[PDB]
């Protein structure tokens, strides 16, 4: 998505979490902006030494390496529950004889 999610000067609208106390669980979403306590000293919502903002921008420029260029990703997960299956395929017809 270099054509869409990059611009001259660098697109910084896209962020990523750089720090976290633990790994995420499957399909866990963490959107917290709590100041990451890297050390033993509580941050009390104050950044500084061993007190970092957990998020950081992507440097998306049109001139960026393919590795560093933006890529749009959609993950499709198929929920199966004890409830009617409502998402089905097209099931194509044939002519009648």
């Amino acid at each position: 998505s270099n054509n869409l999610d990059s611009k001259v000067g660098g697109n910084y609208n896209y962020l990523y979490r750089l720090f976290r106390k633990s790994n995420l669980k499957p399909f866990e979403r963490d959107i917290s902006t709590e100041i990451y306590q890297a050390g033993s000293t509580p941050c009390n919502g104050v950044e500084g030494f061993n007190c970092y903002f957990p998020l950081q921008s992507y440097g998306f420029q049109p001139t960026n390496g393919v590795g560093y260029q933006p890529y749009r990703v959609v993950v499709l997960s198929f929920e199966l529950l004890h409830a009617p299956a409502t998402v089905c395929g097209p099931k194509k017809s044939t002519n009648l004889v």
């Epitope: 902006t33 100041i35 500084g48 970092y52 903002f53 998020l55 950081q56 921008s57």
Partner: nanobody
Framework: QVQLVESGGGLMQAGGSLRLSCAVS????????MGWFRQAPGKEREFVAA????????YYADSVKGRFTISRDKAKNTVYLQMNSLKYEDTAVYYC????????????????????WGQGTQVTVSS
């Protein structure tokens, strides 16, 4: 696009105080961090202080630390520099600056190229 307008510079005696303001206008929802820089005549530009827009946390260069307070008003879209115990070295043109860039390490803002600059306001410290 944003435009930055400094104000509150001028003459003051060494050991006294001054308050610089900088008003942000344009696409202000895009401000990630703000900074103050200074440049005496004939010497290179120098980082003074930075503030993260969300959180309000401040990073200062060693030369001003404990003398200067950076602060922000999200509502009024303005960054302040409270200069106390003014000295010889403080004399310079002061520039405010804006970046749309989120850096995890607040210290990054000392060295990181900002996106927009004010025209500047002159500070002069009497003998």
């Amino acid at each position: 696009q944003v435009q930055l307008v400094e104000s509150g510079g001028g003459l003051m005696q060494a050991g006294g105080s001054l308050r610089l303001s900088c008003a942000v206008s344009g696409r202000t929802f895009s401000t990630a961090a703000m900074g103050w820089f200074r440049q005496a005549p004939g010497k290179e530009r120098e980082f003074v202080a930075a503030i993260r827009w969300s959180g309000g946390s401040a990073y200062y260069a060693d030369s001003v630390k404990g003398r200067f307070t950076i602060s922000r008003d999200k509502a009024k879209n303005t960054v302040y520099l409270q200069m106390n115990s003014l000295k010889y070295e403080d004399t310079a043109v002061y520039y405010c600056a804006q970046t749309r860039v989120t850096r995890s390490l607040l210290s990054d803002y000392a060295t990181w190229p900002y996106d927009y600059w004010g025209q500047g306001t002159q500070v002069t410290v009497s003998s």
